[PDB]
Structure 1
Amino acid sequence: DILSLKEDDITKMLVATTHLGSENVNFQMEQYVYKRRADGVNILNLGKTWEKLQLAARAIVAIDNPSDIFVISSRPIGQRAVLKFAKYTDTTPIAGRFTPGAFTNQIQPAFREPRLLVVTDPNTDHQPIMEASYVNIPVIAFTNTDSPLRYIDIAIPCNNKSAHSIGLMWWLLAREVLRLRGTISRSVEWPVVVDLFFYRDPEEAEKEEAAAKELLPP
């Protein structure tokens, strides 16, 4: 049905190399890895990791404040997606530094009090995950094979080292947050592109203008 897999998306999922998993597997994560090629290409299940999204989607709703879901990233290749992910939903974008600890805050009258941390990588963004260990926080992490799972529920096994994978899944999150009482008229094709959560180029940004207006004089 509509909540099922909808294999037009796997045509795009091959593009972001989600099949490509890392070499080292970490037995918690082995439940998602389908199999391995010779010499280190651990191919994960693609319908498991798609079923995690709607499981993540069935989780991300029933948080009546869309403010109180802290999307975070530390890596800059995970940063252009994540602040642009908070454009449509009303989540709070946390790009880069956290200033540990956020926990007796400075100027803000209300607290920077999250209620569902979600994080592009459990390895490198390890700091507020173990700081989500104090204030009763469910943490969804986009994972590879080699990942910690300490204080993680749930994991989403994608690739999490290419620019395109994190570029994809935040758009894959962007659908199902809006398909499920987010009023996008029940999974129609998208007015927003599925590639805006990408580096237009790796930094430094070459002179690719807004909608690429080309120079008539040299």
Structure 2
Amino acid sequence: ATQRKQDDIKRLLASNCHQATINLNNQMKRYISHKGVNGIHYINIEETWQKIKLAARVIAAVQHPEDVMVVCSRIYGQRAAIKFAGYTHCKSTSSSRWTPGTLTNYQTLKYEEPRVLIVTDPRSDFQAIKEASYVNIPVIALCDSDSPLAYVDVVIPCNNRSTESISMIYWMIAREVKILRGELSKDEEWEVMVDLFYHKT
């Protein structure tokens, strides 16, 4: 608990990143702290923080950022993740329609060959993960309690339901990646509001 870390957990809490649906894929058993009277499943936030940083370290690892690929289906993380790809200089799946064959078919128009893949809802974005499975491509996923971890290498426990949550997760990851890349000081605050990544109605 530095001031930095306290700011991190405060941000995470405020964005309500720790609220989950009621189903537990048992694969998630380890990431979930509390099970409430109202059935709400509560995530340990420390695990979230840790995983965010881990992820950032995987992304810093790929030499050339365009070999990292963010994939999102839902409407919330469209905005957030396109901004993410914006600051992170990587590739975005914009069209919510992921084309079967995108990773597998060298003949497709959307054809990509990332070194690392990042998905917003393993459950929604599943076809992407399945394709990654055919190519030897590792995956960082944003993961709710209901989400299958099959073929998922880094789990960041989240609430991938809300804009607030998803957006501030992609945000924090982006900021940490910036830091690791020396595009940003470790001590310095980032002038980009989280509010950008929110989905406007």
TM-score between the two structures when normalised by the length of structure 1: 0.85
Q: How does 1:57-96 map to 2 (within 5 A)?
A: 57-95=56-94, 96=96
3-state DSSP of counterpart to 1:87: helix
Counterpart for residue 191 of structure 1: 191
Q: How does 1:101-140 map to 2 (within 5 A)?
A: 101-102=101-102, 103-106=105-108, 112-140=112-140
Indicate conservation of the 8 Å contact 2:16/2:165, yes or no. Answer: yes
Could you say if the C-alpha distance between residues 59 and 41 of structure 1 is closer, same or farther in structure 2, counting changes exceeding 3 Å?
A: same
Q: How does 1:1-218 map to 2 (within 5 A)?
A: 6-95=5-94, 96-102=96-102, 103-106=105-108, 112-200=112-200, 202=201
Instruction: Note the C-alpha offset of 1:106.
Output: 4.3
Instruction: Note the C-alpha offset of 1:105.
Output: 2.4
Per-residue Cα deviation, 1:106-163 (whole angstroms, up to 9, x for no partner): 469xx62111110101011111110011111001110011111110011100111012
3-state DSSP of counterpart to 1:6: helix
Identity level (%): 46
Q: Take 1:187 and 1:121, find their aligned partners in 2: how far apart are those partners?
A: 31
| Cα RMSD for the two superposed structures | 1.8
Q: Which amino acid aligns with 2:166?
A: I
Q: Take 2:182 and 2:157, find their aligned partners in 1: how far apart are those partners?
A: 24
Q: Take 1:122 and 1:42, find their aligned partners in 2: how far apart are those partners?
A: 18
Q: Take 1:106 and 1:137, find their aligned partners in 2: how far apart are those partners?
A: 18
Indicate conservation of the 8 Å contact 1:5/1:47, yes or no. Answer: no
Task: Compare CA radii of gyration and give the structure with the larger one.
Answer: 1
Number of matched residues? Answer: 198
Per-residue Cα deviation, 1:36-62 (whole angstroms, up to 9, x for no partner): 111311111011111111111121112
Unmatched runs of 5 consecutive residues or more in structure 1: 203-218
Superposition misfits of 4+ residues, deviation over 4 angstroms: none
Q: Take 1:166 and 1:71, find their aligned partners in 2: how far apart are those partners?
A: 13
3-state DSSP of counterpart to 1:25: coil
3-state DSSP of counterpart to 1:14: helix
Q: Take 2:109 and 2:60, find their aligned partners in 1: how far apart are those partners?
A: 30
Q: Which amino acid aligns with 1:161?
A: R
TM-score between the two structures when normalised by the length of structure 2: 0.92
Instruction: Note the C-alpha offset of 1:98.
Output: 2.2
Counterpart for residue 208 of structure 1: none
Indicate conservation of the 8 Å contact 2:81/2:167, yes or no. Answer: no
Higher helix fraction (1 or 2) = 2
Could you say if the C-alpha distance between residues 170 and 42 of structure 1 is closer, same or farther in structure 2, counting changes exceeding 3 Å?
A: same
Instruction: Note the C-alpha offset of 1:183.
Output: 2.0
